[PDB]
Design a protein around this nucleic acid. Structure first.
Ligand SMILES: [Mg+2]
Ligand SMILES: [Mg+2]
Ligand SMILES: [Mg+2]
Ligand SMILES: [Mg+2]
Ligand SMILES: [Mg+2]
Ligand SMILES: [Mg+2]
Ligand SMILES: [Mg+2]
Ligand SMILES: [Mg+2]
Ligand SMILES: [Mg+2]
Ligand SMILES: [Mg+2]
Ligand SMILES: [Mg+2]
Ligand SMILES: [Mg+2]
Ligand SMILES: [Mg+2]
Ligand SMILES: [Mg+2]
Ligand SMILES: [Mg+2]
Ligand SMILES: [Mg+2]
Ligand SMILES: [Mg+2]
Ligand SMILES: [Mg+2]
Ligand SMILES: [Mg+2]
Ligand SMILES: [Mg+2]
Ligand SMILES: [Mg+2]
Ligand SMILES: [Mg+2]
Ligand SMILES: [Mg+2]
Ligand SMILES: [Mg+2]
Ligand SMILES: [Mg+2]
Ligand SMILES: [Mg+2]
Ligand SMILES: [Mg+2]
Ligand SMILES: [Mg+2]
Ligand SMILES: [Mg+2]
Ligand SMILES: [Mg+2]
Ligand SMILES: [Mg+2]
Ligand SMILES: [Mg+2]
Ligand SMILES: [Mg+2]
Ligand SMILES: [Mg+2]
Ligand SMILES: [Mg+2]
Ligand SMILES: [Mg+2]
Ligand SMILES: [Mg+2]
Ligand SMILES: [Mg+2]
Ligand SMILES: [Mg+2]
Ligand SMILES: [Mg+2]
Ligand SMILES: [Mg+2]
Ligand SMILES: [Mg+2]
Ligand SMILES: [Mg+2]
Ligand SMILES: [Mg+2]
Ligand SMILES: [Mg+2]
Ligand SMILES: [Mg+2]
Ligand SMILES: [Mg+2]
Ligand SMILES: [Mg+2]
Ligand SMILES: [Mg+2]
Ligand SMILES: [Mg+2]
Ligand SMILES: [Mg+2]
Ligand SMILES: [Mg+2]
Ligand SMILES: [Mg+2]
Ligand SMILES: [Mg+2]
Ligand SMILES: [Mg+2]
Ligand SMILES: [Mg+2]
Ligand SMILES: [Mg+2]
Ligand SMILES: [Mg+2]
Ligand SMILES: [Mg+2]
Ligand SMILES: [Mg+2]
Ligand SMILES: [Mg+2]
Ligand SMILES: [Mg+2]
Ligand SMILES: [Mg+2]
Ligand SMILES: [Mg+2]
Ligand SMILES: [Mg+2]
Ligand SMILES: [Mg+2]
Ligand SMILES: [Mg+2]
Ligand SMILES: [Mg+2]
Ligand SMILES: [Mg+2]
Ligand SMILES: [Mg+2]
Ligand SMILES: [Mg+2]
Ligand SMILES: [Mg+2]
Ligand SMILES: [Mg+2]
Ligand SMILES: [Mg+2]
Ligand SMILES: [Mg+2]
Ligand SMILES: [Mg+2]
Ligand SMILES: [Mg+2]
Ligand SMILES: [Mg+2]
Ligand SMILES: [Mg+2]
Ligand SMILES: [Mg+2]
Ligand SMILES: [Mg+2]
Ligand SMILES: [Mg+2]
Ligand SMILES: [Mg+2]
Ligand SMILES: [Mg+2]
Ligand SMILES: [Mg+2]
Ligand SMILES: [Mg+2]
Ligand SMILES: [Mg+2]
Ligand SMILES: [Mg+2]
Ligand SMILES: [Mg+2]
Ligand SMILES: [Mg+2]
Ligand SMILES: [Mg+2]
Ligand SMILES: [Mg+2]
Ligand SMILES: [Mg+2]
Ligand SMILES: [Mg+2]
Ligand SMILES: [Mg+2]
Ligand SMILES: [Mg+2]
Ligand SMILES: [Mg+2]
Ligand SMILES: [Mg+2]
Ligand SMILES: [Mg+2]
Ligand SMILES: [Mg+2]
Ligand SMILES: [Mg+2]
Ligand SMILES: [Mg+2]
Ligand SMILES: [Mg+2]
Ligand SMILES: [Mg+2]
Ligand SMILES: [Mg+2]
Ligand SMILES: [Mg+2]
Ligand SMILES: [Mg+2]
Ligand SMILES: [Mg+2]
Ligand SMILES: [Mg+2]
Ligand SMILES: [Mg+2]
Ligand SMILES: [Mg+2]
Ligand SMILES: [Mg+2]
Ligand SMILES: [Mg+2]
Ligand SMILES: [Mg+2]
Ligand SMILES: [Mg+2]
Ligand SMILES: [Mg+2]
Ligand SMILES: [Mg+2]
Ligand SMILES: [Mg+2]
Ligand SMILES: [Mg+2]
Ligand SMILES: [Mg+2]
Ligand SMILES: [Mg+2]
Ligand SMILES: [Mg+2]
Ligand SMILES: [Mg+2]
Ligand SMILES: [Mg+2]
Ligand SMILES: [Mg+2]
Ligand SMILES: [Mg+2]
Ligand SMILES: [Mg+2]
Ligand SMILES: [Mg+2]
Ligand SMILES: [Mg+2]
Ligand SMILES: [Mg+2]
Ligand SMILES: [Mg+2]
Ligand SMILES: [Mg+2]
Ligand SMILES: [Mg+2]
Ligand SMILES: [Mg+2]
Ligand SMILES: [Mg+2]
Ligand SMILES: [Mg+2]
Ligand SMILES: [Mg+2]
Ligand SMILES: [Mg+2]
Ligand SMILES: [Mg+2]
Ligand SMILES: [Mg+2]
Ligand SMILES: [Mg+2]
Ligand SMILES: [Mg+2]
Ligand SMILES: [Mg+2]
Ligand SMILES: [Mg+2]
Ligand SMILES: [Mg+2]
Ligand SMILES: [Mg+2]
Ligand SMILES: [Mg+2]
Ligand SMILES: [Mg+2]
Ligand SMILES: [Mg+2]
Ligand SMILES: [Mg+2]
Ligand SMILES: [Mg+2]
Ligand SMILES: [Mg+2]
Ligand SMILES: [Mg+2]
Ligand SMILES: [Mg+2]
Ligand SMILES: [Mg+2]
Ligand SMILES: [Mg+2]
Ligand SMILES: [Mg+2]
Ligand SMILES: [Mg+2]
Ligand SMILES: [Mg+2]
Ligand SMILES: [Mg+2]
Ligand SMILES: [Mg+2]
Ligand SMILES: [Mg+2]
Ligand SMILES: [Mg+2]
Ligand SMILES: [Mg+2]
Ligand SMILES: [Mg+2]
Ligand SMILES: [Mg+2]
Ligand SMILES: [Mg+2]
Ligand SMILES: [Mg+2]
Ligand SMILES: [Mg+2]
Ligand SMILES: [Mg+2]
Ligand SMILES: [Mg+2]
Ligand SMILES: [Mg+2]
Ligand SMILES: [Mg+2]
Ligand SMILES: [Mg+2]
Ligand SMILES: [Mg+2]
Ligand SMILES: [Mg+2]
Ligand SMILES: [Mg+2]
Ligand SMILES: [Mg+2]
Ligand SMILES: [Mg+2]
Ligand SMILES: [Mg+2]
Ligand SMILES: [Mg+2]
Ligand SMILES: [Mg+2]
Ligand SMILES: [Mg+2]
Ligand SMILES: [Mg+2]
Ligand SMILES: [Mg+2]
Ligand SMILES: [Mg+2]
Ligand SMILES: [Mg+2]
Ligand SMILES: [Mg+2]
Ligand SMILES: [Mg+2]
Ligand SMILES: [Mg+2]
Ligand SMILES: [Mg+2]
Ligand SMILES: [Mg+2]
Ligand SMILES: [Mg+2]
Ligand SMILES: [Mg+2]
Ligand SMILES: [Mg+2]
Ligand SMILES: [Mg+2]
Ligand SMILES: [Mg+2]
Ligand SMILES: [Mg+2]
Ligand SMILES: [Mg+2]
Ligand SMILES: [Mg+2]
Ligand SMILES: [Mg+2]
Ligand SMILES: [Mg+2]
Ligand SMILES: [Mg+2]
Ligand SMILES: [Mg+2]
Ligand SMILES: [Mg+2]
Ligand SMILES: [Mg+2]
Ligand SMILES: [Mg+2]
Ligand SMILES: [Mg+2]
Ligand SMILES: [Mg+2]
Ligand SMILES: [Mg+2]
Ligand SMILES: [Mg+2]
Ligand SMILES: [Mg+2]
Ligand SMILES: [Mg+2]
Ligand SMILES: [Mg+2]
Ligand SMILES: [Mg+2]
Ligand SMILES: [Mg+2]
Ligand SMILES: [Mg+2]
Ligand SMILES: [Mg+2]
Ligand SMILES: [Mg+2]
Ligand SMILES: [Mg+2]
Ligand SMILES: [Mg+2]
Ligand SMILES: [Mg+2]
Ligand SMILES: [Mg+2]
Ligand SMILES: [Mg+2]
Ligand SMILES: [Mg+2]
Ligand SMILES: [Mg+2]
Ligand SMILES: [Mg+2]
Ligand SMILES: [Mg+2]
Ligand SMILES: [Mg+2]
Ligand SMILES: [Mg+2]
Ligand SMILES: [Mg+2]
Ligand SMILES: [Mg+2]
Ligand SMILES: [Mg+2]
Ligand SMILES: [Mg+2]
Ligand SMILES: [Mg+2]
Ligand SMILES: [Mg+2]
Ligand SMILES: [Mg+2]
Ligand SMILES: [Mg+2]
Ligand SMILES: [Mg+2]
Ligand SMILES: [Mg+2]
Ligand SMILES: [Mg+2]
Ligand SMILES: [Mg+2]
Ligand SMILES: [Mg+2]
Ligand SMILES: [Mg+2]
Ligand SMILES: [Mg+2]
Ligand SMILES: [Mg+2]
Ligand SMILES: [Mg+2]
Ligand SMILES: [Mg+2]
Ligand SMILES: [Mg+2]
Ligand SMILES: [Mg+2]
Ligand SMILES: [Mg+2]
Ligand SMILES: [Mg+2]
Ligand SMILES: [Mg+2]
Ligand SMILES: [Mg+2]
Ligand SMILES: [Mg+2]
Ligand SMILES: [Mg+2]
Ligand SMILES: [Mg+2]
Ligand SMILES: [Mg+2]
Ligand SMILES: [Mg+2]
Ligand SMILES: [Mg+2]
Ligand SMILES: [Mg+2]
Ligand SMILES: [Mg+2]
Ligand SMILES: [Mg+2]
Ligand SMILES: [Mg+2]
Ligand SMILES: [Mg+2]
Ligand SMILES: [Mg+2]
Ligand SMILES: [Mg+2]
Ligand SMILES: [Mg+2]
Ligand SMILES: [Mg+2]
Ligand SMILES: [Mg+2]
Lengths: 144, 76, 134
RNA sequence: UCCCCCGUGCCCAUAGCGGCGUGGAACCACCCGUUCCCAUUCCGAACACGGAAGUGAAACGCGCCAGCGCCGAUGGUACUGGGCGGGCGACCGCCUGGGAGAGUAGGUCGGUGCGGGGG
RNA sequence: GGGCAGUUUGACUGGGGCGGUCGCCUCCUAAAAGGUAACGGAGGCGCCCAAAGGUCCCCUCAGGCGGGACGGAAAUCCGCCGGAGAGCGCAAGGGUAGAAGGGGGCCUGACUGCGAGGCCUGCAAGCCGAGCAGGGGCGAAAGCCGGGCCUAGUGAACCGGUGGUCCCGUGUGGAAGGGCCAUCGAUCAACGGAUAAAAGUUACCCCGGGGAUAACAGGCUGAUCUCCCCCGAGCGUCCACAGCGGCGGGGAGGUUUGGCACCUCGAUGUCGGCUCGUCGCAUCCUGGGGCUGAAGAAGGUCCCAAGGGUUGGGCUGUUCGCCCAUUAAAGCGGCACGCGAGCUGGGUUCAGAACGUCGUGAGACAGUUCGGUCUCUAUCCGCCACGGGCGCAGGAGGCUUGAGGGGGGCUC
RNA sequence: UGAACGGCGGCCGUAACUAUAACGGUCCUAAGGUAGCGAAAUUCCUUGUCGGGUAAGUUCCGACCUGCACGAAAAGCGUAACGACCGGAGCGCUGUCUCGGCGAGGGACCCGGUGAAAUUGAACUGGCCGUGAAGAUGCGGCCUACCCGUGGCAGGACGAAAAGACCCCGUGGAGCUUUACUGCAGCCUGGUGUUGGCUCUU
RNA sequence: UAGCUGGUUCUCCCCGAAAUGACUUUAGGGUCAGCCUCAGGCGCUGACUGGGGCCUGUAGAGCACUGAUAGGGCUAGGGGGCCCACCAGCCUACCAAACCCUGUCAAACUCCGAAGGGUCCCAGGUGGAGCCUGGGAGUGAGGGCGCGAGCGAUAACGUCCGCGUCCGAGCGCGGGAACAACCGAGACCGCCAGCUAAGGCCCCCAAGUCUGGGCUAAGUGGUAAAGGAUGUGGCGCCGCGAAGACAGCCAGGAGGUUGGCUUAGAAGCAGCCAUCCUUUAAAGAGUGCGUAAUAGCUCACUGGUCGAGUGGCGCCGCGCCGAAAAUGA
RNA sequence: CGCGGGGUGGAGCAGCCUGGUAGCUCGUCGGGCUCAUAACCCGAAGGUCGUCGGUUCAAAUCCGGCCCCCGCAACCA
RNA sequence: AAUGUAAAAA
């Protein structure tokens, strides 16, 4: 809500008042120039209390406009998909035959019982971070 | 705005300055406390009022650590 | 802070006590006109001062806002001002020393104080520590 | 007329706090005792009576010291009855009469009145 | 028991209503006597106590440091410093230990009958009071006591209650009923208190007044609003001013919103539109420039410059604004927000009616909705035109000079 | 006892992404607004959002529902026909408009006859810039201006008209209202008069 | 009925208000007081003034109380770090009670404290003074100006008090262009006489184009600020200079060095930290520009020439910019 | 801005007026019955009383400023 | 006096 951005307008009010309403402009129109979103107010006899209210109103809407854009840049980072369905998985942990398996690196293993306890290092270190940065490190150094 | 208040002015202070002739019984000084102590030929009432005790002349005496005093030097 | 409530305006009579001498630092900035100096003023000067000579010497401020400055909010005539919109100011009679600097070259303190002057409403003077003491 | 002491006033710190010293013949105090008068929300600490011995340690008396406290000019200034003069003002300047506070120089461990005992 | 009737329904108030306030005490404002206003700054009272009173006698605080079984910053004890920063029932102030403060013995003067002389004061009230008489309390006595350290703790008169006595008692004796003395019934708190007894509504409204007082406009003011400057943190890769300018500071203007209440209430017609304009320049375009982070074309920024120009539609009563299609550009302000004795009357702002809403209600609404009478004759100034008179120091016909004005002024 | 006056909730939590919340917790009530409708003759924010129509639509129509502040006989939702009712659109047609022109007649104008009115302190009544009770023909300074009329225009004379209706004041007035006060009519009611006989009964 | 509006008729003479306080279903009305006037009475007292006594808490100042306050010191408490646990120890460019030093602020703070004011005594003061008792009143919306405060915004022709004062009622006279209250001055009547006051003395317009010494070049004067500038004149101070300066011009202007560190690069030149020497007459581990980083230009400094003054800073007078409005100046 | 109300264990409410000890329901935690979960039974824990000041021997409680939430009001021209 | 999902018959 920097004063440099929005323009404020003054104009006589619609409705009752006497000569006071005709000759005294108390209505206000506070348009936000960049975002284009405008707002008008005139519920009180005063220009300042309308100029004041019309601003607290614009604040609410501009907060709800910043929360919408605050979503794509804090939710698109989560995952561009993730069905959670079947096959949407990237690493299976089979306790019957005792074998985990990262479907990304194709890497395999033989201890689901310990891995599900802390042995993630062996996975993240060598293979995981590798393929993770690989799919993006081969994308930039070729075409993207 | 709760504030538009005060109480009556009590018009106190010295009522008879030094040298002034006085009739017995008439008042010399009205005061908040004992801003003046009685002394010779001068009595004091419930409110700390000092009043001459016999026709005479008022005179004031300062006695430092012991405070100021009002006296009536008689004559007749 | 503490004190109590809001306070009468009074008047900025002759600069009787509105005078002084340096007592800290080598250089000083003295007032030449009577005025209520705002906190926003004192500060803006002080900051703009250090801001000038980064990690520089040490500045002293001998004037201090204790007076509540009131202000009715765009209306008519009831009660005393809710006031304090400008909050607090310091009384300054022409001649009083306000800001001391120390531990910097003359040209380094001839600028620092030159600036702090501008952030102030009144006309001011810069001073060497002459030689007048007690 | 002089000196010491006892009691009691007057001004109201230049009379006070503190450190050092001196006084027991006289006076004063502590001091011996608690039968009697009297007394303790307990206690002869206090109040009280009867009083030798000892002491001047305590208290007080006198005298020295200026660390604290207190007193504190002169000179100039702020302010200001009254009278004027300059600027938009927040303000400022002169004539005439009065004149601080702070601070500097200094001062002070008192001065005196009545009665009484004693050289 | 509003079917009906007579009435009540407070004042202050930078207009009125709404809110707040109304008496009393303390402090400041108050300008060194007293007094002193504002819807100026701050707080209390509408009680309490038979001990918290009288007198006689005795005792002296808070706090700090040190030492002490519970204690633990703080209970009670001891020591040293400590003049009053404690306490004085309760707000504050003044006063105060050479007691007004803490404790104890006896006690009830929180007496009756008075009252010299004063303080304060418009009235009426309020306050202080020596001493005299009676009969008393404490003290050996001198003496002290007519409540409380003091300043708030309150209510004229009327009307009535209870108790008592030298009073009156309607021909006389009693009685009734009064008087006098004593005391009781006040948030009469709008607190000098109209009645024993009282709320609203009007846009269906009326009269008397007011520019003593609000709504329009002008005025003063310039907070607010618009424009412009000072400083130069920082941005701009390098470069603080090509373009920008944190935190602060100084001004101009009188288009906004306010403040004030100065002319007008025996009337200054309020918005918008239409018509007709004219002026300002802080310039939208066109004309001329400086800088550019200006190759050119095009821009950006500042300077000079009113001479002319500055479109047509959609939506809404709109001003404003959004939008469509163009343009050299589609400038901003003044003129009573120019202009209703020029027009309109869609909006506001009478009576009808309805919705939501509030109110038991009558009604009410910067809430909404449909409807709703705008006055032939210009005297003067001014303005557009057109004549009559006289003058122009012979009379007449025709032709002329241009002092001084006016018109025009655009752009692709 | 409601087709009598009337009334008809609040806070927090919960879903195979997020959002929402069919579900739940709790407090309170006499009971917590059902159907149907809903930015409405009701919606403040508001020109709500989306769709329609238009080159462009604060209006209009269709939707959605976070209904400031609908809602069921002060009726709810619909409804053919009807309407000098109020809103939106289109076709036809047009001087409504671009944008005005010409023409006719009745006035206006000139001559003859008759002959009013409101208004009116008195007038020998110019412009600007100041000024003054703050908007000047009348004051100051300056500019301008021969005397008198006729046809026209309406910026001024704070023009005329109506002792402002708006506002406030007055211990003014009146109409209306009620659980304001006090009365009255009216209606209810005990005693008694008009009012008598016989019998049972406590 | 009208606490409201309007209206109220001949002359001369003397005096001459108020717009405040208290209470008021009072607020544009009233009652009492204040102020005006008339009558009778008292008779030096009255305003103002001299001398003396007492009462006082403002201006100013001050920090001793109540609070506020910047820096430093000393130092409980708490916080971080070393170290740890039995709790103990030290460090502490963190915050900070008490205390102290330096430096300050306060209407509701005062160790202090004026000028002044109040009152009484004595004296001057015979004045449209004063006091006592009465008859008659009006006024009870004030306004501006100076000064002292509150409110407001250290706004208002604003508002509310205090001491004055003028208008009111002196819109009678002079000055101020015009203009109740600013400056001068209190109009009984007449004069073709004189001196003055404020203000003025070039023309409208009376009176000096007076005298002497300066300043100002803007039409300033003829009405505006922060702030900006080689405007102009004046006093003062420091320094350079005939042993040769200032300015311009001829020449060098460097070596290790390319300073250590940051950084893609930082070579005197984004920033951070900074204190060598030497060829020598002189050149700074560097004033500005130029770069991607450098080289290039220049000052600083020294040599020569010239040949007489020159540069910085403080102070005062007057002036310049800052400076845009609507009917004609 | 004006007047009125409110802020207390994780959720929602008492307690305050008349100061001395903070209560109710839900959820949470431990233990039970069940094959297991829920229901149900037995235990237990949990609160700066919004915040900053003031009164008092003592403050959730009374007084005052502030922040936050709720409702009402914002009219005449 | 409720509930118990989703991968097993040469
Ligand atoms: Mg910007
Ligand atoms: Mg509208
Ligand atoms: Mg209305
Ligand atoms: Mg209206
Ligand atoms: Mg207006
Ligand atoms: Mg206006
Ligand atoms: Mg008051
Ligand atoms: Mg004293
Ligand atoms: Mg007495
Ligand atoms: Mg500091
Ligand atoms: Mg108002
Ligand atoms: Mg408040
Ligand atoms: Mg001898
Ligand atoms: Mg020793
Ligand atoms: Mg002994
Ligand atoms: Mg015995
Ligand atoms: Mg005996
Ligand atoms: Mg005995
Ligand atoms: Mg004895
Ligand atoms: Mg010894
Ligand atoms: Mg001793
Ligand atoms: Mg010696
Ligand atoms: Mg000494
Ligand atoms: Mg002196
Ligand atoms: Mg000025
Ligand atoms: Mg001034
Ligand atoms: Mg003198
Ligand atoms: Mg002195
Ligand atoms: Mg001494
Ligand atoms: Mg002596
Ligand atoms: Mg009844
Ligand atoms: Mg009735
Ligand atoms: Mg007003
Ligand atoms: Mg009002
Ligand atoms: Mg009203
Ligand atoms: Mg009211
Ligand atoms: Mg008052
Ligand atoms: Mg109270
Ligand atoms: Mg007592
Ligand atoms: Mg004792
Ligand atoms: Mg302590
Ligand atoms: Mg201790
Ligand atoms: Mg101990
Ligand atoms: Mg101890
Ligand atoms: Mg111990
Ligand atoms: Mg124990
Ligand atoms: Mg403890
Ligand atoms: Mg201890
Ligand atoms: Mg002890
Ligand atoms: Mg000891
Ligand atoms: Mg003392
Ligand atoms: Mg003290
Ligand atoms: Mg006490
Ligand atoms: Mg007390
Ligand atoms: Mg006191
Ligand atoms: Mg004493
Ligand atoms: Mg006692
Ligand atoms: Mg006692
Ligand atoms: Mg006792
Ligand atoms: Mg007597
Ligand atoms: Mg008397
Ligand atoms: Mg009286
Ligand atoms: Mg009277
Ligand atoms: Mg007596
Ligand atoms: Mg007797
Ligand atoms: Mg007595
Ligand atoms: Mg007492
Ligand atoms: Mg007593
Ligand atoms: Mg007592
Ligand atoms: Mg008193
Ligand atoms: Mg009566
Ligand atoms: Mg008798
Ligand atoms: Mg009889
Ligand atoms: Mg008998
Ligand atoms: Mg009697
Ligand atoms: Mg009441
Ligand atoms: Mg009253
Ligand atoms: Mg009453
Ligand atoms: Mg009456
Ligand atoms: Mg009554
Ligand atoms: Mg009444
Ligand atoms: Mg009707
Ligand atoms: Mg009527
Ligand atoms: Mg008037
Ligand atoms: Mg009035
Ligand atoms: Mg108008
Ligand atoms: Mg006007
Ligand atoms: Mg400017
Ligand atoms: Mg930036
Ligand atoms: Mg940069
Ligand atoms: Mg300014
Ligand atoms: Mg204007
Ligand atoms: Mg205005
Ligand atoms: Mg007026
Ligand atoms: Mg007025
Ligand atoms: Mg008229
Ligand atoms: Mg008229
Ligand atoms: Mg109009
Ligand atoms: Mg109009
Ligand atoms: Mg151009
Ligand atoms: Mg070009
Ligand atoms: Mg180019
Ligand atoms: Mg380029
Ligand atoms: Mg280019
Ligand atoms: Mg081209
Ligand atoms: Mg130029
Ligand atoms: Mg220009
Ligand atoms: Mg257009
Ligand atoms: Mg377009
Ligand atoms: Mg074009
Ligand atoms: Mg364009
Ligand atoms: Mg265009
Ligand atoms: Mg403009
Ligand atoms: Mg125009
Ligand atoms: Mg108009
Ligand atoms: Mg205007
Ligand atoms: Mg208009
Ligand atoms: Mg009309
Ligand atoms: Mg119109
Ligand atoms: Mg008309
Ligand atoms: Mg019509
Ligand atoms: Mg229209
Ligand atoms: Mg309409
Ligand atoms: Mg209307
Ligand atoms: Mg009407
Ligand atoms: Mg109607
Ligand atoms: Mg409206
Ligand atoms: Mg309509
Ligand atoms: Mg007609
Ligand atoms: Mg005329
Ligand atoms: Mg004219
Ligand atoms: Mg010509
Ligand atoms: Mg021409
Ligand atoms: Mg022309
Ligand atoms: Mg032209
Ligand atoms: Mg039913
Ligand atoms: Mg209902
Ligand atoms: Mg409802
Ligand atoms: Mg979910
Ligand atoms: Mg039920
Ligand atoms: Mg509903
Ligand atoms: Mg619909
Ligand atoms: Mg709508
Ligand atoms: Mg709509
Ligand atoms: Mg509304
Ligand atoms: Mg709407
Ligand atoms: Mg609307
Ligand atoms: Mg829309
Ligand atoms: Mg869309
Ligand atoms: Mg459209
Ligand atoms: Mg559309
Ligand atoms: Mg449509
Ligand atoms: Mg909805
Ligand atoms: Mg919705
Ligand atoms: Mg809703
Ligand atoms: Mg809303
Ligand atoms: Mg509403
Ligand atoms: Mg609704
Ligand atoms: Mg409803
Ligand atoms: Mg119904
Ligand atoms: Mg329907
Ligand atoms: Mg139909
Ligand atoms: Mg019909
Ligand atoms: Mg019809
Ligand atoms: Mg058609
Ligand atoms: Mg047209
Ligand atoms: Mg014709
Ligand atoms: Mg005719
Ligand atoms: Mg005809
Ligand atoms: Mg004719
Ligand atoms: Mg003429
Ligand atoms: Mg002009
Ligand atoms: Mg005038
Ligand atoms: Mg005049
Ligand atoms: Mg005129
Ligand atoms: Mg004249
Ligand atoms: Mg004229
Ligand atoms: Mg002319
Ligand atoms: Mg004619
Ligand atoms: Mg005509
Ligand atoms: Mg006209
Ligand atoms: Mg006409
Ligand atoms: Mg007219
Ligand atoms: Mg009238
Ligand atoms: Mg009344
Ligand atoms: Mg009846
Ligand atoms: Mg009957
Ligand atoms: Mg009957
Ligand atoms: Mg009967
Ligand atoms: Mg019968
Ligand atoms: Mg006379
Ligand atoms: Mg006279
Ligand atoms: Mg009246
Ligand atoms: Mg009178
Ligand atoms: Mg005399
Ligand atoms: Mg004093
Ligand atoms: Mg002072
Ligand atoms: Mg001392
Ligand atoms: Mg203190
Ligand atoms: Mg204290
Ligand atoms: Mg240390
Ligand atoms: Mg510690
Ligand atoms: Mg430890
Ligand atoms: Mg420890
Ligand atoms: Mg340590
Ligand atoms: Mg003071
Ligand atoms: Mg005081
Ligand atoms: Mg003085
Ligand atoms: Mg005097
Ligand atoms: Mg004579
Ligand atoms: Mg006279
Ligand atoms: Mg006289
Ligand atoms: Mg006399
Ligand atoms: Mg008289
Ligand atoms: Mg009278
Ligand atoms: Mg009156
Ligand atoms: Mg008045
Ligand atoms: Mg005056
Ligand atoms: Mg002045
Ligand atoms: Mg005021
Ligand atoms: Mg001031
Ligand atoms: Mg003024
Ligand atoms: Mg008058
Ligand atoms: Mg006079
Ligand atoms: Mg005049
Ligand atoms: Mg003239
Ligand atoms: Mg004048
Ligand atoms: Mg005149
Ligand atoms: Mg005059
Ligand atoms: Mg003079
Ligand atoms: Mg002249
Ligand atoms: Mg100027
Ligand atoms: Mg100026
Ligand atoms: Mg100037
Ligand atoms: Mg200047
Ligand atoms: Mg420059
Ligand atoms: Mg040199
Ligand atoms: Mg030589
Ligand atoms: Mg040069
Ligand atoms: Mg050369
Ligand atoms: Mg060279
Ligand atoms: Mg060269
Ligand atoms: Mg070289
Ligand atoms: Mg060189
Ligand atoms: Mg070179
Ligand atoms: Mg180097
Ligand atoms: Mg180089
Ligand atoms: Mg080169
Ligand atoms: Mg200078
Ligand atoms: Mg100067
Ligand atoms: Mg210019
Ligand atoms: Mg003009
Ligand atoms: Mg909670
Ligand atoms: Mg309780
Ligand atoms: Mg109970
Ligand atoms: Mg449970
Ligand atoms: Mg469990
Ligand atoms: Mg269990
Ligand atoms: Mg158990
Ligand atoms: Mg447990
Ligand atoms: Mg609390
Ligand atoms: Mg909340
Ligand atoms: Mg909320
Ligand atoms: Mg509301
Ligand atoms: Mg209202
Ligand atoms: Mg309204
Ligand atoms: Mg109304
Ligand atoms: Mg109304
Ligand atoms: Mg009305
Ligand atoms: Mg098979």
């Amino acid at each position: 809500l920097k004063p440099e951005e929005l323009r404020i307008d003054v104009m006589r009010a619609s409705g009752p008042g006497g000569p006071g309403v005709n000759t005294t402009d108390s209505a206000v129109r506070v348009v936000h120039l960049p975002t284009g979103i405008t707002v008008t107010c005139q519920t009180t006899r005063s220009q300042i209390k309308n100029k004041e209210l019309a601003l607290k109103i614009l604040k609410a809407r501009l907060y709800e406009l910043e929360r919408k854009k605050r979503e794509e840049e804090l939710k698109a980072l989560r995952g561009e998909v993730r069905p959670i369905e079947w096959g949407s998985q990237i690493r299976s942990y089979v306790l019957d035959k005792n074998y985990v398996k990262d479907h990304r690196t194709g890497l395999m293993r033989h201890d689901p019982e310990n891995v599900l306890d802390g042995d993630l290092m062996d996975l993240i270190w060598a293979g995981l971070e590798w393929k993770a940065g690989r799919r993006q490190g081969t994308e930039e150094v070729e075409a993207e | 705005t709760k504030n538009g208040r005060d109480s009556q002015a009590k018009r106190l202070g010295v009522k008879r300055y030094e040298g002034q002739v006085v009739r017995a019984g008439n008042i010399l000084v009205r005061q908040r406390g004992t801003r003046f102590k009685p002394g010779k030929n001068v009595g004091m009432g419930r409110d700390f009022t000092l009043f001459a005790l016999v026709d005479g002349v008022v005179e004031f005496q300062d006695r430092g650590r012991l405070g100021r005093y009002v006296h009536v030097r008689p004559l007749a | 802070r503490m004190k109590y409530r809001k306070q009468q305006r009074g008047r900025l009579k002759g600069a009787t006590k509105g005078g002084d001498y340096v007592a800290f630092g080598d250089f000083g900035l003295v007032a030449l006109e009577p005025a209520w100096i705002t906190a926003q003023q004192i500060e803006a000067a002080r900051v703009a001062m250090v801001r000038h000579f980064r990690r520089g010497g040490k500045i002293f401020i001998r004037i201090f806002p204790d007076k509540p400055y009131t202000k009715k909010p765009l209306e008519v005539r009831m009660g005393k001002g809710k006031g304090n919109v400008e909050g607090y100011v310091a009384v300054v009679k022409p001649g009083r020393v306000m800001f001391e600097v120390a531990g910097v070259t003359e040209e380094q303190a001839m600028e620092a104080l030159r600036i702090a002057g501008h952030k102030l409403p009144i006309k001011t003077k810069i001073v060497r520590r002459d030689a007048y003491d007690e």
